[PDB]
Tab-separated table of C-alpha atoms in Angstrom:
chain	number	residue	atom	x	y	z
A	1	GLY	CA	-92.769	134.785	70.507
A	2	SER	CA	-94.408	131.464	71.292
A	3	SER	CA	-93.884	128.146	73.036
A	4	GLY	CA	-95.591	125.178	74.648
A	5	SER	CA	-95.397	121.434	75.169
A	6	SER	CA	-96.645	118.512	77.227
A	7	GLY	CA	-96.914	114.744	77.452
A	8	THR	CA	-97.580	111.782	79.713
A	9	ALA	CA	-97.854	108.011	79.866
A	10	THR	CA	-97.770	105.003	82.163
A	11	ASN	CA	-97.682	101.220	82.110
A	12	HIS	CA	-96.406	98.165	83.945
A	13	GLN	CA	-96.586	94.437	83.312
A	14	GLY	CA	-94.628	91.199	83.283
A	15	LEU	CA	-94.837	87.426	83.501
A	16	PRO	CA	-92.407	84.541	84.038
A	17	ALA	CA	-91.806	81.851	81.443
A	18	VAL	CA	-90.173	78.454	81.106
A	19	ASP	CA	-87.015	77.408	79.301
A	20	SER	CA	-84.572	74.568	78.761
A	21	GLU	CA	-80.833	74.451	79.338
A	22	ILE	CA	-79.579	70.938	79.976
A	23	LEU	CA	-79.765	68.851	76.824
A	24	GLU	CA	-81.023	65.285	76.680
A	25	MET	CA	-77.534	63.823	76.541
A	26	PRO	CA	-76.806	64.200	72.819
A	27	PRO	CA	-75.045	61.429	70.884
A	28	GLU	CA	-71.628	61.631	69.268
A	29	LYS	CA	-69.336	59.479	67.160
A	30	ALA	CA	-66.615	59.616	64.533
A	31	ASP	CA	-64.923	56.710	62.795
A	32	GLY	CA	-64.974	54.638	59.628
A	33	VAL	CA	-62.981	52.024	57.752
A	34	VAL	CA	-59.225	52.005	57.287
A	35	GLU	CA	-57.253	52.219	54.064
A	36	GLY	CA	-53.609	52.583	53.105
A	37	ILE	CA	-50.855	50.355	51.771
A	38	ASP	CA	-50.018	52.234	48.594
A	39	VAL	CA	-49.411	50.355	45.364
A	40	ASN	CA	-46.495	50.538	42.959
A	41	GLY	CA	-47.334	52.728	39.987
A	42	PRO	CA	-48.722	56.144	39.027
A	43	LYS	CA	-50.992	57.726	41.609
A	44	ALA	CA	-53.791	60.175	40.908
A	45	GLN	CA	-53.231	63.473	42.679
A	46	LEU	CA	-56.538	64.903	43.840
A	47	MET	CA	-56.844	68.389	45.283
A	48	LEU	CA	-59.597	68.361	47.881
A	49	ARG	CA	-61.038	71.852	48.122
A	50	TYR	CA	-63.421	72.538	50.981
A	51	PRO	CA	-66.117	75.229	50.877
A	52	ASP	CA	-65.123	76.558	54.278
A	53	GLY	CA	-62.271	78.036	52.276
A	54	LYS	CA	-59.621	75.530	53.292
A	55	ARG	CA	-58.164	72.936	50.953
A	56	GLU	CA	-56.193	69.706	51.030
A	57	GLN	CA	-54.315	67.661	48.458
A	58	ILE	CA	-54.054	63.887	48.587
A	59	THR	CA	-52.810	61.037	46.429
A	60	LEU	CA	-54.932	58.042	45.505
A	61	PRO	CA	-54.576	55.147	43.053
A	62	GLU	CA	-56.123	55.308	39.602
A	63	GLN	CA	-57.731	51.963	40.345
A	64	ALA	CA	-59.089	53.252	43.634
A	65	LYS	CA	-62.872	53.360	43.640
A	66	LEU	CA	-64.187	56.904	43.452
A	67	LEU	CA	-65.858	56.082	46.747
A	68	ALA	CA	-62.354	55.938	48.171
A	69	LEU	CA	-62.006	59.647	47.500
A	70	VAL	CA	-65.604	60.192	48.539
A	71	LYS	CA	-64.964	58.405	51.813
A	72	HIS	CA	-61.957	60.644	52.336
A	73	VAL	CA	-63.968	63.843	52.099
A	74	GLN	CA	-66.555	61.922	54.084
A	75	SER	CA	-64.281	61.281	57.040
A	76	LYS	CA	-62.840	64.751	56.593
A	77	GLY	CA	-66.201	66.276	57.428
A	78	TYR	CA	-68.433	66.195	54.372
A	79	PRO	CA	-71.047	63.489	53.768
A	80	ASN	CA	-71.767	62.798	50.117
A	81	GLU	CA	-75.488	62.591	50.775
A	82	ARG	CA	-74.964	66.154	51.939
A	83	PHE	CA	-72.017	67.610	50.061
A	84	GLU	CA	-71.023	66.754	46.511
A	85	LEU	CA	-67.554	66.413	45.035
A	86	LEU	CA	-66.803	68.285	41.833
A	87	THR	CA	-63.848	68.574	39.486
A	88	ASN	CA	-61.971	71.385	37.783
A	89	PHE	CA	-63.072	70.827	34.204
A	90	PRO	CA	-65.188	69.848	32.731
A	91	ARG	CA	-67.565	70.414	35.622
A	92	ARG	CA	-68.396	66.882	36.701
A	93	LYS	CA	-70.330	65.941	39.815
A	94	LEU	CA	-68.486	62.888	41.082
A	95	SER	CA	-71.583	60.869	41.893
A	96	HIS	CA	-73.996	60.378	39.018
A	97	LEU	CA	-71.418	58.274	37.216
A	98	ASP	CA	-70.673	55.739	39.926
A	99	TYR	CA	-68.321	54.839	42.752
A	100	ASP	CA	-67.625	51.227	41.862
A	101	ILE	CA	-65.672	52.757	39.003
A	102	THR	CA	-62.063	53.883	39.196
A	103	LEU	CA	-60.497	57.255	39.899
A	104	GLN	CA	-59.964	57.152	36.153
A	105	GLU	CA	-63.555	56.497	35.157
A	106	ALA	CA	-64.720	59.267	37.459
A	107	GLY	CA	-62.259	61.325	35.450
A	108	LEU	CA	-59.802	62.257	38.174
A	109	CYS	CA	-56.662	60.950	36.514
A	110	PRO	CA	-53.978	61.560	36.322
A	111	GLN	CA	-54.189	64.754	38.341
A	112	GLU	CA	-57.466	66.537	38.980
A	113	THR	CA	-58.868	69.105	41.380
A	114	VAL	CA	-61.624	67.714	43.569
A	115	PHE	CA	-63.810	70.488	44.930
A	116	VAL	CA	-66.244	70.061	47.797
A	117	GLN	CA	-69.667	71.593	47.283
A	118	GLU	CA	-72.965	71.535	49.138
A	119	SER	CA	-75.565	69.184	47.712
A	120	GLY	CA	-79.302	69.732	47.962
A	121	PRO	CA	-81.895	67.145	49.010
A	122	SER	CA	-80.329	64.021	47.555
A	123	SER	CA	-78.694	65.190	44.348
A	124	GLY	CA	-81.448	67.745	43.883
């Protein structure tokens, strides 16, 4: 038979610190241009697909400047400078090309799937 044990210790300290709660009245805004008035003819159906997991389909003109679609996703909650718009196939990053072009040039006609992706530091 056998047995035994023991132990001990002690301590005590503390000190107050600072902190911040109230913010310095942060800014806030949300608004842009205004488009509409559809035109007579074939429209390009674009399927906006957000990364969050949600999606949204819209209809724009084939003559509509890519920017138009870009602005859409822009007002939706995705700045180009930040996020980049892609297609279904072939994989095309709606940007390099240009915006002054047409939904067609960008290659989003007639119907194409526009996916929203996160862009690095300015393109990359």
